[PDB]
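Why run this: before we spend reagent on co-expression, it is cheaper to look at a predicted model of the complex and decide which construct boundaries make sense. The entries below are exactly what would go into the expression plan.
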Amino acid sequence: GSHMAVQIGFLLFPEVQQLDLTGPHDVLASLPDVQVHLIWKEPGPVVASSGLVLQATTSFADCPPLDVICIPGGTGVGALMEDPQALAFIRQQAARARYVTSVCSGSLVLGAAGLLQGKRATTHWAYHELLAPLGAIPVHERVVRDGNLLTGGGITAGIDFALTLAAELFDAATAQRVQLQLEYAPAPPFNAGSPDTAPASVVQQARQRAADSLHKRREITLRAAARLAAG
Amino acid sequence: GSHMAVQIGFLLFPEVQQLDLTGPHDVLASLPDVQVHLIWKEPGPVVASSGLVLQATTSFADCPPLDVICIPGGTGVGALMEDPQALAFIRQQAARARYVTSVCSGSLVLGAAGLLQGKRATTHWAYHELLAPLGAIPVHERVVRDGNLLTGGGITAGIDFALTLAAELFDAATAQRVQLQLEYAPAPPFNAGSPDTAPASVVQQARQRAADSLHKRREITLRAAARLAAG
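The model came back. Tokens follow.
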């Protein structure tokens, strides 16, 4: 309107881990004058990994130049990593976006798009070995920042970095106001959010359950890397 | 199937604060054998306060007996507090549910349904004075438990209590596994999630911005209380 509207965009794709996206969405959608997009090849229903149905609000072609782009993760990321249209849109938008961001395995899509080369980055802990092949410097921190790239490992990392983005786009007082108004005050009743804090028996379970997925994602990653190499 | 399916149900209503619901949804939907419902007067699109579109999966009438019911908050709660159909469904389900829960201003709906009488409970901090008129013992804690009632003040409190519910429905090892697999490891870059930690200037801003809403919600609350009194 008669203020500058910040254009904020989430990639919304089948089998997305919905909370990756919906967390930062509610935070950023609180900010003054912003316009938030859920972006897919076409507008309309997209099913998340839980069966939860979201609605994409815009196609790739109709998406305005974004100020913030965010790629969430989820099972659906493996397909996205070899999706030439999606990767081309992500590259297009990343060229000029003020902020390029991802949650969870969303960073592996950034990697497949060629956007992690020589960058410090993280991803979901079970898939961390897939960073180096995509040219990233792999870093084990909840949110890793490299210039205007922010990558968050865990499911709610986007809620946290959304507050950082709020403070920079606007001011610290604005970010603090949003945190208070939403009353965002996390206090988990367990301490098993990191493979370095969870019980060993639990870490081994989770490694065992992710094994087939990691195997499949590694094969995809190596194909994505070879495409980038051929350059 | 050939295991017992826990029936988990979120009230999904127009102008819901979506993250209230989508947080605990992704956590609980991770649990073994569970079936998760988004419940409204009819299945189909429901617009959240941000403009984000969700899909209700079931009507009141078709909703199975729930093991967990969760009422989220958001601007839409004021209408819900005087919605005789919605209140009757919430009472019906609460009678036998193992767990009755809410996030944010969702507890004021529980209160309007007559379910907070003599119970310790919390709600969104800006509306906390509305607890006593609905018969609750108001408590300032992130998640307040009274028997099988859990009420959470802030936007992600349901993510946290979802882990508690996981541990009780199944076991601590299961809850820890879910936390690790999702990599839920919150670390906000500000400390303004409570009116006792945020800067005073920020707390006064937020109080000023919520004033009209609180005024309107108080009027609604007092009508809801008088209905309960007439008994």
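Helices of chain B lie at 18-28, 77-80, 84-96, 106-112, 157-169, 172-182, 200-209, 211-230. Chain B is about 40% helix and 20% strand. Bring this page to Monday's planning discussion.
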